[PDB]
Amino acid sequence: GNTTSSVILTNYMDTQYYGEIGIGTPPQTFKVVFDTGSSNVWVPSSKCSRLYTACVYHKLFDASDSSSYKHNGTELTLRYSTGTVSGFLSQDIITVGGITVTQMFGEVTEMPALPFMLAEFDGVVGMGFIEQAIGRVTPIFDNIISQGVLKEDVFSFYYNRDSQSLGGQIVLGGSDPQHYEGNFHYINLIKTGVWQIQMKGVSVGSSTLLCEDGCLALVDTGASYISGSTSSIEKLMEALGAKKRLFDYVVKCNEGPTLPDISFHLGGKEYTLTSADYVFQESYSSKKLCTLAIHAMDIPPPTGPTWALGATFIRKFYTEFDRRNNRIGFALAR
Numbered sequence: 001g002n003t004t005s006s007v008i009l010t011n012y013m014d015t016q017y018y019g020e021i022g023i024g025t026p027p028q029t030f031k032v033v034f035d036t037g038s039s040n041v042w043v044p045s046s047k048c049s050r051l052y053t054a055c056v057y058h059k060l061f062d063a064s065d066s067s068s069y070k071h072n073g074t075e076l077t078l079r080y081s082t083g084t085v086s087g088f089l090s091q092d093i094i095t096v097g098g099i100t101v102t103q104m105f106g107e108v109t110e111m112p113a114l115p116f117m118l119a120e121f122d123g124v125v126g127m128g129f130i131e132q133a134i135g136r137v138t139p140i141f142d143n144i145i146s147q148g149v150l151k152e153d154v155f156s157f158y159y160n161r162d163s164q165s166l167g168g169q170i171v172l173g174g175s176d177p178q179h180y181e182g183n184f185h186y187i188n189l190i191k192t193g194v195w196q197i198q199m200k201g202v203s204v205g206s207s208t209l210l211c212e213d214g215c216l217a218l219v220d221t222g223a224s225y226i227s228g229s230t231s232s233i234e235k236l237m238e239a240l241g242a243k244k245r246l247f248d249y250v251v252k253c254n255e256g257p258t259l260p261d262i263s264f265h266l267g268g269k270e271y272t273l274t275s276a277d278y279v280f281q282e283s284y285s286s287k288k289l290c291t292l293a294i295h296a297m298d299i300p301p302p303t304g305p306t307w308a309l310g311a312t313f314i315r316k317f318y319t320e321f322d323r324r325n326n327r328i329g330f331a332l333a334r
């Protein structure tokens with residue numbers, strides 16, 4: 001086809017980026033993260049026990065209010081690196097960016113307070129490949145492609161730095177030159193089935209003392225931060241002089257601006273973040289601590305161990321995900 005369409009995103013505190021979808025007839029609206037690091041769609045279910053407080057605080061899909069619902073009921077569990085949801089498969093009509101599609105999705109009945117009581121979003125729309133989909137369910141973008149309406153077999157992500165402006169934008173079927181500049185630099189995927197590319201080094205200043213012999217980088221739109229393995233991140237943080245807490249790393253806020261550049265060697269170029277790009281600079285006080293937008297995520301094989309380039313990275317680099325050619329294009333965001 002020749003359709004290009006967009007999903008307007010909200011940016012909550014530079015840590016959560018989410019848009020809205022409609023499910024059912026009439027449409028029930030959900031806030032969802034669009035996640036290239038997974039391939040299932042899910043929303044919380046009306047059948048979620050209200051003893052799960054997350055299900056008290058989020059919008060619940062009620063199949064009993066939708067005339068286009070089609071029962072399946074196969075149990076499924078989605079195990080993310082940060083937590084787990086469980087429930088069952090349903091089918092209904094999903095509206096995303098004014099595109100309407102028949103989609104199998106998870107109705108989540110078990111929704112733990114961590115992390116989901118911290119989520120502004122209700123659910124997740126996986127933008128990964130069918131090969132990562134739990135229960136082999138056709139991901140939403142594969143179903144949109146099957147309709148033959150999109151101009152290209154690509155989707156693009158813009159995540160704004162500002163958190164009276166759009167928080168971000170997903171273009172389905174292309175990219176938006178309003179939100180990037182210069183040429184795209186394209187890196188091929190290591191393989192179809194995952195949005196993962198070869199990385200050739202991680203530098204702190206001019207010193208590439210990480211990933212010297214090559215490593216993996218997942219381009220993960222559903223992650224808040226840049227992440228690496230615990231041992232990788234520990235060495236990175238020792239070089240920055242950052243202190244490890246339970247869930248994050250911190251520096252004294254006065255040190256934040258003095259922190260060195262971090263470069264990611266992707267497809268022959270250095271993608272450099274300055275301290276402004278990865279320090280939550282909420283203060284300049286030596287008596288306060290400022291969080292870094294980088295932390296440990298230990299991802300098991302076959303996907304990991306791997307780095308993941310989340311919102312911290314995507315904020316600087318507008319990202320095109322090319323399904324037609326199995327590649328990722330990065331351009332300077334604006």
Ligand SMILES: COCCCCc1c(C(=O)N(CC(C)C)[C@@H]2CNC[C@H](C(=O)N3CCOCC3)C2)nnn1-c1ccccc1
Pocket residue numbers: 015016017018033035036037038079080081082083115116118119120124218220221222223224299303308311
């Ligand atoms: C850009 O906006 C994203 C905001 C969500 C970030 C997040 C994640 C998160 O990073 N993920 C799973 C999520 C999508 C349910 C990621 C999404 N991508 C897949 C990741 C994953 O599970 N893996 C394991 C398999 O290999 C790929 C990485 C997890 N977990 N909790 N939170 C969060 C929850 C409340 C408050 C603040 C953060």
Ligand SMILES: *[C@@H]1O[C@H](CO)[C@@H](O)[C@H](O)[C@H]1NC(C)=O
Pocket residue numbers: 071072073074
């Ligand atoms: C659920 O979907 C699977 C695979 O698409 C199918 O084999 C099964 O019959 C469905 N179950 C029900 C109860 O409709």
